[PDB]
Design a protein around this ligand. Structure first.
Ligand SMILES: O=C(Nc1cccc2[nH]ccc12)c1cc2ccc(Br)cc2s1
Ligand SMILES: O=C(Nc1cccc2[nH]ccc12)c1cc2ccc(Br)cc2s1
Ligand SMILES: O=C(Nc1cccc2[nH]ccc12)c1cc2ccc(Br)cc2s1
Ligand SMILES: O=C(Nc1cccc2[nH]ccc12)c1cc2ccc(Br)cc2s1
Lengths: 344, 347, 344, 347
């Protein structure tokens, strides 16, 4: 008191901390709304809801398409939304959440990691089960079960996938060799989505709605195993990543405005957003992941790192929620996209 | 081909997330966490464990249980499950203070344990508010403006000055009562007195004292309360706070519990062997931890519940759960699906 | 290039990234020196070495003692160093590192958490063993073994401690009741250190060198179990925390200069450093821990949080190394205290 | 009293740290990590596993092993243990680039796998340096100054411009060779060509191509290399990079290895079943991960090695180790105690 500085009155729009009062009973909407003033990551959740709603409102504003350069059947809107997620999230029930968004045309580009395609298709053939993180590899191997976090996928699921996939790969090679088709990951993912023909599949809806999927490390997962084994029976498949780079970059540079929602990981480090002459950098970004920055990893980098790359604009107000997206993403969707369903 | 190199597989639950084509049915959405995987599934497991704990607590005491239950000397009648609620001080600076207060107000837990700061921040909030900031705010600028940072929260210096003004006359009475009325102070007794003084239904500690829920915090002096006790001791020396009597009081609760449950937020459990001395039921039958700490450095805060099983603090036959998440997100959701659904049974 | 800003030439004291070159062979001192320019937490390690060396050099500068108010047998020096650590570190081999520092009078005040006293004393009676994090509580219980991270402590170790401790507790109660002794945690820890009479013990050396130990939550660990069981045989022990608060605070407010080294956890949140009229706040601080800030925990708070409390000075350059102190602390000591041994 | 309530206990190593009363004997200090506990003990275990891997690699191939070893079509003669070294791109921006380069220079590993950025940052460092900064540096100010942030490292925009100037004529030759000499490019072949072009002994990829160590990075286009390939394709269209042939090349290495070891820095392993198709020895016999990622979100990067055992990628009988630490601290120490001690055996 004799030793502490007098406090400079805080701004008049300064928000007081207050949690939800259960003496009101349980109104879940009011409970989720109270996260904003609860503090720590609950506050970041509230900030994320605000950012995603701003992104959606921008997208819904009514509108040159550059269709010659984009080579795309999907018309530009007032905000191009990129949805990114790691493959573990597709093994989880967040697959249902992502599918919903894609089914209703709520996002414009999907980006994922190795495994992130096939686990969606495999779930159309056979289920993934709940287990525990602590289950020992020895016991699981003796029982022909693969672990993904606390999830369990029987070996047979991958055997069923192989059987389903092989005649599709045969057609792809035949179409390449005799019909001039130049395959890329995104074109392959669209074909698999068409083939699975199942409304529970993310990739079925993506292709139906002309939402492209980019995954240049497609071969790092089970799909790689299959392509490789297939090549011994029917050699010659080629997958080019350069044309996919051109397709996604033309989306990036001709977007009127850009928003990103990134789950489980971080963003790529590159300068292409600076070549968007209309609006360089994203106006909106939300990350939801548990990774930490201190090892220098891409996954753990804060959004403000991407501002130095030009990937997110200096004047954007990006938000990271430090949490497992399996918990947070359905809540975020409940308060954003699922409210605006009528507009989509 | 894979069938040639992979082994065939030999009450199992399928993974499935909430389908928003059903609309936003919030209870169904929360219920779908259990089958969503990763920490969402641990949330579902926690809901189940807390509800089991609640159902146990609400069971009538049989005649024999009632006898051995009644072997504490305390005010608070014993129930079929003694619930310990533990939390780090940062959560009292957060809005989770309201959630904790609700539980205490309705006698839904039996013992509170917290860390340095965890008492005074509740009391100070009855005198002046805490505000939202950001984690990245620089110490230099905050210092210039007379503002203290707690995570992404902000507490003005003036809050601690108002607290000092409020507290000094109470410390004066406590010393006078110690020296003329034979009062032997301990942290728990001080915490009860401060709750009674604040006399405000938004205060966790007001309700704890009103409902005879003891609060234990032997490192009481490591926070702002320490600062004030210290300065007070200049003009009014000799206040004694005995931690041994508080140890006796908490261990007596632990030892004579018919059954024990723990809900621990923000940190981990203490390492000791006292639960092995409960004659009726050694170790906790239920336990939920909610925190983001990791085990790999050997820290208490990051230890899995199964560590405490080796100490006897949690029973081998219990099914404890840790949700690896910030309790500011998870705890209100947990309460919504557990205690808040059974509020009438506690009224 | 057409889209990227020209780079503003960096400061002339800007340091280039370069790792150790093993084509030189293996000089471990040069290897540790190269951490500074390696990046990420290796760079923070280098910064920590610099900060600890600055703290030591300050302490070693030749010098009013305020002995009336401090009530202390230890003379003030040009820098009071506080060493803080969580109890798990005393179960680890970092016990040997801490003991070395205390034995050679290299620090002035020890602060620890529940368990942090007794595990040092118990190791003088019986050993702790290596195990694994994944060992199941059921199996350990069946074999009478307690787990601490990947360390294992037999139940018998605690039984031996009980037998050793009981007659000391008897003496403490007798001294309280008939010789006017007013016990506090710090006085108790000094007595136990004297009693263990073993040069492997941290607390033996602390008492021998008049380095006080503060642990107001002393009763949260095994020592609490013992005090409690003892009270059934010999009631009446009182441990006051207020007098310990006065002792440590008088150290804090009369220090000429303050440095802190904090292992495994964060600092306490209070304003007492502002009452040091000579030099308010610490001039030097190093934290070594793996905790993350995003939940708002004290353990995970960056040093810059404590600057807002006045606990660390605005003009200090504190460092956090995001790492397990079991790896980093011996390396830090090798490059700092262990180099200046001749000066102590 | 405790003896009354606690059970008695039934090649075990005692905990003991390095004693600095012995002076600063650095090798003895490093050796004491094994008995220090927590991650220090995991470091000791990693040293042991990497040394076992090295001793295996240096074993002569028997006559039978030599036959089945020789079933790849590759330049690089097969050895008794094929070591895969994996690392995230951030580590190439760090000083660990020098450590990796040393291993590659001396043929101490057999296959390199990295992420987007992990190729170009090595090449760019031969044209211009990376500098130390801080994690907290604000994007706004860095943008104003034309500086890119990678953790606490700083790379000026001008570095990427110099890289573009250097790279464009090489991309011109690659397209010309593709269209007139029948070259079928893949990421690994491009990486080999870029190493040969840079022609600088500080470059990881210079040494990899010189020593016939293939590099695999199917997401090559997710970094700055992508930016440049993209712009190049305006005036010189049609470059194809086939990821299927690279898949074939890496799987052939994996399938015909006599024995496999992995050292993975910064991230986790891929999830697939290809190791189950190695006829001689399915799964890795040795594996060390060094990263700070946590498993609880189900992420690849945070998975324990024992997850990969369920996929067949690591053998049930292996004793894999994860050190939970920033590889910038740990990897040079690991190399000091393993590969660097056996350098003569690799020369
Ligand atoms: O931003 C990305 N990709 C690109 C956007 C725009 C133009 C691009 N060109 C080349 C790449 C690329 C990202 C891809 C992924 C993948 C998984 C996860 Br989780 C996050 C992200 S963020
Ligand atoms: O279990 C605890 N205390 C005790 C229970 C029962 C008998 C006892 N005797 C001595 C101590 C003690 C715990 C105390 C705290 C404090 C903050 C947080 Br977060 C978690 C915990 S768990
Ligand atoms: O700063 C501390 N204590 C105090 C210094 C000076 C005056 C004080 N008054 C009341 C408390 C106190 C700290 C105590 C501890 C304990 C374990 C670990 Br890890 C870190 C720390 S930091
Ligand atoms: O194991 C990997 N790749 C493969 C080995 C063998 C046969 C394969 N086939 C298809 C992929 C592949 C890994 C790749 C990477 C990349 C960065 C980091 Br950090 C760790 C790893 S581990």
């Amino acid at each position: 008191a004799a030793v502490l500085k007098h406090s400079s009155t805080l701004p008049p729009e300064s928000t007081q901390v207050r949690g939800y009062d259960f003496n009101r009973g349980v109104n879940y909407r009011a409970l989720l709304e109270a996260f904003g003033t609860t503090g720590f990551q609950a506050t970041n959740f509230g900030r994320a809801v605000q950012q995603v709603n701003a992104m959606i409102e921008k997208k819904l504003e009514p509108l040159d398409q550059h269709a010659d350069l984009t080579q795309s059947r999907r018309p530009l809107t007032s905000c191009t939304i990129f949805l990114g997620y790691t493959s573990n999230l597709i093994s989880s029930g967040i697959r249902e959440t992502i599918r919903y968004l894609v089914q209703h045309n709520m996002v414009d580009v999907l980006v994922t990691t190795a495994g992130g395609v096939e686990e969606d298709l495999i779930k159309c053939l056979a289920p993934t089960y709940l287990g525990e993180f602590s289950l020992r590899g020895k016991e699981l191997r003796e029982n022909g079960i693969n672990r993904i976090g606390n999830l369990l996928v029987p070996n047979e699921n991958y055997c069923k996938f192989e059987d389903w996939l092989m005649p599709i790969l045969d057609q792809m090679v035949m179409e390449q060799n005799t019909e001039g088709v130049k395959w890329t990951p995104s074109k392959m993912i669209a074909r698999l989505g068409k083939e699975i023909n199942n409304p529970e599949s993310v990739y079925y809806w993506a292709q139906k709605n002309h939402i492209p999927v980019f995954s240049p490390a497609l071969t790092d997962g089970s799909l790689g195993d299959m392509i490789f084994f297939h090549s011994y029976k029917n050699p010659g498949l080629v997958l080019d990543i350069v044309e996919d780079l051109r397709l996604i970059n033309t989306q990036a540079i001709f977007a009127k405005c850009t928003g990103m929602i990134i789950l489980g990981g971080g963003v790529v480090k590159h300068h292409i957003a600076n070549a968007n002459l209309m609006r360089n950098g994203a106006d909106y970004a939300v990350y939801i992941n548990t990774a930490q920055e201190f090892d220098g990893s891409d996954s753990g980098a804060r959004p403000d790192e991407a501002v130095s790359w030009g990937k997110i604009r200096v004047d954007a107000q990006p938000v990271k929620v430090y949490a497992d997206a399996s918990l947070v993403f359905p809540l975020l969707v409940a308060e954003t996209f699922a409210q605006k369903m009528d507009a989509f």
